[PDB]
């Protein structure tokens, strides 16, 4: 009675992993809401996070190729103390280091004197030198081009023809499971590739409430990503009127360094309010209690030691990589100012062999910045769920980008299908 009828253009899809376009090529966005659908999402199996990670690494590596190498500056340094007025907390933090640098001429050196942060130098004992640059015994140092900025620029990931991106609009979406309010887009919204290690800055806020996302909430080896519904503002500054000088080290190689600091030296601090931070932590704890016992005491603590790039909270305020100390922020059991250390020679992500030198920017650097999320890690159930301790632990950078790509899934369109009809060909 019934016959096979072939249809082409069937609105069905399968989960798939394909290559996405990076648009910024400004797209004309479209969004089609899908009525009466349910789609299973899994933010921790989303290939878009791995592809975004690879794209950011490739763009970063490409940006540093046509730039000045600092190979001739891997020389011994004669470092002494800074003669300006400093406080007790900054004793030994900044050093005045002299060295012999090359010039455009191959057989004519030049004495130089430059201020360096203590974190950027390592002791090395010789008759006339005291320190060397931290990375010169591990890898070449490449100077970032001063014409190229670091500041995140929102980008869009776009599926190729034959593929589509599904967006989950459900409130209180925990990152996995079914989603009912699902729409189809060709390109994602503008996602800022913001680089941070403990707090998520300039990201997306939750529509309804604080959302706690974990691949396995009972596995203490996985990170917990907390998205806030309200932002908490961070005011960061390096209160030092830095005077930047430069020297020519090769035929086309110009090197930039700290020349001097005008006036007294004061430390580099980020201010977060106390009323809103206390409300934020109360909300986070209230949401945590829904994944643990209702009478379990939840306490926050300082991060563990080891690997300064992880133990501190990074930004890219101005053009200078801060590294703040959240120990005074999470020291509570359920304003505020954070001493931030400055480095210039940065090994970003967890790579070894590619060292980038961030040149200083003249003047003061002050930036205000929305905190939109947190990365928390649990210490472990050593008390049998009597008391739980959470720390602002670090993790791979994928966790920050996943915190934006959790709403998107890539699906492959399958235009063909078959179905019974009474239609017989002849």
């Amino acid at each position: 009675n019934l016959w096979v009828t072939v249809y082409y253009g069937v609105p069905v899809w399968k989960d798939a992993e394909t290559t996405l376009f990076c648009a910024s090529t400004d797209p004309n966005p479209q969004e089609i809401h899908l009525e009466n659908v349910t789609e299973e999402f899994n933010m921790w199996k989303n290939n878009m996070v791995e592809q975004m990670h690879e794209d950011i690494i490739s763009l970063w590596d490409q940006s540093l190729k046509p730039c000045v190498k600092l190979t001739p500056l891997c020389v011994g340094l004669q470092c002494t103390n800074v003669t300006n007025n400093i406080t007790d907390d900054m004793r030994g933090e900044l050093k005045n280091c002299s060295f012999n640098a090359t010039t455009e001429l191959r057989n004519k050196r030049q004495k130089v004197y430059s201020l360096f942060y203590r974190l950027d130098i390592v002791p090395m004992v010789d008759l006339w030198t005291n320190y060397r640059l931290i990375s010169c015994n591990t890898s070449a140092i490449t100077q970032a081009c001063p014409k190229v900025s670091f500041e995140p620029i929102p980008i869009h990931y776009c599926a190729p023809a034959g593929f589509a991106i599904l967006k989950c609009k459900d409130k209180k979406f925990n990152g996995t499971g079914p989603c009912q309010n699902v729409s189809t887009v060709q390109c994602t919204h503008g996602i800022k590739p913001v680089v941070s290690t403990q707090l998520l800055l300039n990201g997306s806020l939750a529509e309804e409430e604080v959302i706690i996302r974990s691949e396995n909430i009972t596995n203490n080896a996985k990170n917990i990503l907390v998205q806030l519904n309200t932002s908490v503002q961070i005011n960061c500054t390096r209160p030092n009127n830095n005077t930047v000088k430069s020297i020519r080290i090769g035929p086309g190689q110009a090197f930039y360094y700290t020349g001097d600091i005008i006036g007294d030296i004061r430390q580099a601090h980020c201010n977060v309010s106390k009323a809103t931070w206390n409300e934020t932590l109360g909300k986070v704890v209230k949401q945590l209690r829904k994944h643990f016992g209702n009478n379990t005491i939840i306490r926050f603590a300082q991060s563990s030691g080891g690997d300064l790039e992880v133990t501190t909270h990074s930004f890219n305020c101005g053009g200078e990589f801060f590294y703040c100390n959240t120990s005074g922020l999470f020291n509570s059991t359920w304003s505020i100012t954070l001493p931030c250390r400055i480095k210039q020679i940065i090994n970003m992500w967890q790579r070894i062999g590619q060292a980038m030198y961030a040149p200083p920017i003249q003047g003061v650097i002050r930036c205000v910045s929305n905190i939109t999320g947190l990365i928390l890690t649990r210490d472990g159930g050593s008390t049998n769920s009597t008391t739980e301790t959470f720390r602002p632990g670090g993790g791979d950078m994928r966790d920050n980008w996943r915190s934006e790509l959790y709403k998107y899934k890539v699906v492959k369109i399958e235009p063909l299908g078959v179905a019974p009809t009474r239609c017989k060909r002849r």
Binding site: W3, V4, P11, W13, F21, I32, L34, A164, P420
Partner: protein, 120 residues
């Protein structure tokens, strides 16, 4: 008027009215790989329709009868009470048998038409 995949959650007998909306939306190294794979997927689907004798059509009727072992349902529940996604899931791993039957039926039809057109 619903847009691309707008009918995806609608019933099969309603979503079948929007086949042109889906069809029109099917068309540096990474960008070329994405464009070439989209072209290859389109061309494989078009060649597969051509092998079945359905070239140039979006709704193509054939001479393969429906087996009750593939889906023991009536037309009302298939077309009016379920979506194409649920149907596609229901007949998963039965499509290769259907495709083979469609290929063989078209080969037999082409031979029969050639023999009919060979009569003086």
């Amino acid at each position: 008027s619903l847009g691309f995949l707008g009918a995806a959650g609608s019933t099969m007998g309603a979503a079948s009215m929007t086949l042109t909306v889906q069809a029109r939306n099917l068309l540096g190294i990474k960008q070329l790989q994405a464009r070439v794979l989209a072209v290859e997927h389109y061309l494989r689907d078009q060649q597969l329709l051509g092998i079945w004798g359905c070239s140039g059509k979006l709704i193509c009727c054939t001479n393969v009868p429906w087996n009750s072992s593939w889906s023991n349902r009536n037309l009302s529940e298939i077309w009016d009470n379920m979506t194409w996604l649920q149907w596609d899931k229901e007949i998963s791993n039965y499509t290769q048998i259907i495709y083979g039957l469609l290929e063989e039926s078209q080969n037999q039809q082409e031979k029969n038409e050639q023999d009919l057109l060979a009569l003086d």
